[PDB]
Every structure is written in C-alpha cells, then in structure tokens.
Amino acid sequence: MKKKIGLLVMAYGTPYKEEDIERYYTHIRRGRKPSPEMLEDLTERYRAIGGISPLATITLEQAKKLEKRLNEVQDEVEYHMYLGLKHIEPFIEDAVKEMHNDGIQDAIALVLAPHYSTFSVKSYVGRAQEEAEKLGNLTIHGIDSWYKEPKFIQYWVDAVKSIYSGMSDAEREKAVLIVSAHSLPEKIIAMGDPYPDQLNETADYIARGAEVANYAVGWQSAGNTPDPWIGPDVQDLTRELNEKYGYTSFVYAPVGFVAEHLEVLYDNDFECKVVTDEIGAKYYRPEMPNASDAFIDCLTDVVVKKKESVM
C-alpha cells in the first residue's frame, strides 16, 4: 500500500570538525587549496561565532524531523530521506547512489533555501539529476522554490512580530526591517534569473502580515570576483538608510537562510552590529527557523504539495 518515495534533502554543507575547514574551503575553491592567510581568517571567523560543531547538526536535524513529520501527517506514502551536501560528506552523488541501491524509483528533491536561482537549480537539483540518468530508472522531481508557502511567511511574520511588539511606539517609527539573502553575480539578472524579484516579494509579504511600516531588501555574503555581485550589501545599506531616513533601529531578517550558520552568526550578528554600533543604532536579529517544529510543519506542506503535483 505505502508507495516508497525518496526524499532528497539538499544544502551547502558545513565543517563537522576544525580539521574539515581546509578540505571544505578546498572543495569550495574548485579543489584549489586556500593560502595560510585565507585559512587563518576563515578559522578566526568560526572561533568568533563560538565554534564549528553546533552549526553542523542543524541541517541533519531539519532533514530527520521532516522525514518523521511527513510519515505521520499522511498514510498514503512512505517517505525515505537521503541527505546530500554540496561541499562535504555526505555528498549529493553519494546520497543519490544510496537511493538507487535501495530501489527508490521516484524522489522529491528539496533545497534548504526558499528561493529559486539558477545557481541553486544547477548546484543541487541539476547535479542530482546527472547521477539519476547515469544510473538509470530514477526520476528526481525538483521543487523550484517555496517562498510563497503560507506557513513559511507566517513563521517570519510571527518572528518579526515578537521584536516589534517589544518596541516603544516611538522607536517603532525610527525602525526598519531589513530583508536579506545570499548575493550572486549580477550576470544572472540579464540572463533572466528571478531571484531578486522573489526576495522582493518575500519582503512584501512579511512586512504586510507583520504590519511593519518600513522595510528594505539587502544582500550579504558576496564572494570575491572581478565580476560585480548583486547589491546593495547589508553593511552599506544600513548606513544609507540611516543617512537619508534616520533609522535608529534595524531588524535583520536573513530570509534566504533557514539556519544559524556562519553567514548569519558572522555576516549579520558580527558585521552588521558593527555598522549599528557606529551610527548609534539598535540591532535586532530574530531566531532563524533552524529545526523548530513550526518550520518542519512548513516543509511538510511544501513536500505534500509537490507530491500532489507529481502523483
């Protein structure tokens, strides 16, 4: 009776121990080992945010809680979960290989990032489908995005509601909600990538449902290339809006991310707080979804919806 469906959950990956940092950075750099200088900086950023190990368990927990919740909320299908990471074990290819050996014929692929981009599609779903065809008899169905999902927007609306309801009505007038995601090279825009458009819309839904008067979209974690990346960066954006609009409070909602990883704990909690402390302004950053049960229930719906579209 229970149709066995594979659940391929994907993410970027993160070092498990400190002696993973090197080979992790190496993989990220297309196999090009990092220099002593760059390695020490990376290592230092991890020390600053309180270590690499607490970050490592969030992704797997998300995956595992999702597997359990899915097989509870419905009787029709048995979901068998497999985790594939981009830059560390278990790699995407070793995950889809296991899925093949177990006899899984159809699998639903879910990226742990709400927005569509060409980077994501080719990094995850496209990479997974390259082994699926190589081995034969396995069809992977990719979820394009899930930012418009009612329980995703409600999570962040609720999260932002908390912070704003503890503000004085005066501070509320001098506060701005800054909505962000990981930056990508600007080339994608000319190419037709609707990623910045999807983030813009996400900001509109969250601000509206939270009843927040002022908001703005920003970007973070841009790489180091000669090619320009999508801006403005959150650090620069903070200074600009404080200048022409005089915001003395900034609420960072890094909506492209689902977890407190290096990008949130450093790029927001460290680097943005530096900007706010300068301009004489207050800093707020609400809880990331991480493995919270309300987030898992959101992911359960996106997977039930996708299955209903795939039968």
From Swiss-Prot:
GO molecular function: ferrochelatase activity; metal ion binding
GO cellular component: cytoplasm
EC annotation from Swiss-Prot or TrEMBL: 4.99.1.9
Location relative to the cell: Cytoplasm
Classification via PROSITE patterns: FERROCHELATASE
CDD domains given in the database record: Ferrochelatase_C, Ferrochelatase_N
Binding site for Fe-coproporphyrin III: 12, 29, 45-46, 53, 124
Keywords: Cytoplasm, Heme biosynthesis, Iron, Lyase, Metal-binding, Porphyrin biosynthesis
List of residues binding Fe(2+): 182, 263
UniProt catalytic activity: Fe-coproporphyrin III + 2 H(+) = coproporphyrin III + Fe(2+)
Pathway involvement of the protein, from the record: Porphyrin-containing compound metabolism; protoheme biosynthesis
InterPro entries hit by this protein: Ferrochelatase, Ferrochelatase_AS, Ferrochelatase_C, Ferrochelatase_N
Gene Ontology biological-process annotations: heme biosynthetic process
Coiled coil start-end: none
UniProt function note: Involved in coproporphyrin-dependent heme b biosynthesis. Catalyzes the insertion of ferrous iron into coproporphyrin III to form Fe-coproporphyrin III.
Family listed: Belongs to the ferrochelatase family.
PANTHER family for the chain: FERROCHELATASE (PTHR11108), FERROCHELATASE, MITOCHONDRIAL (PTHR11108:SF1)
Protein name listed in UniProt: Coproporphyrin III ferrochelatase 1
Organism: Bacillus anthracis
Name of the gene encoding the protein in the UniProt record: cpfC1
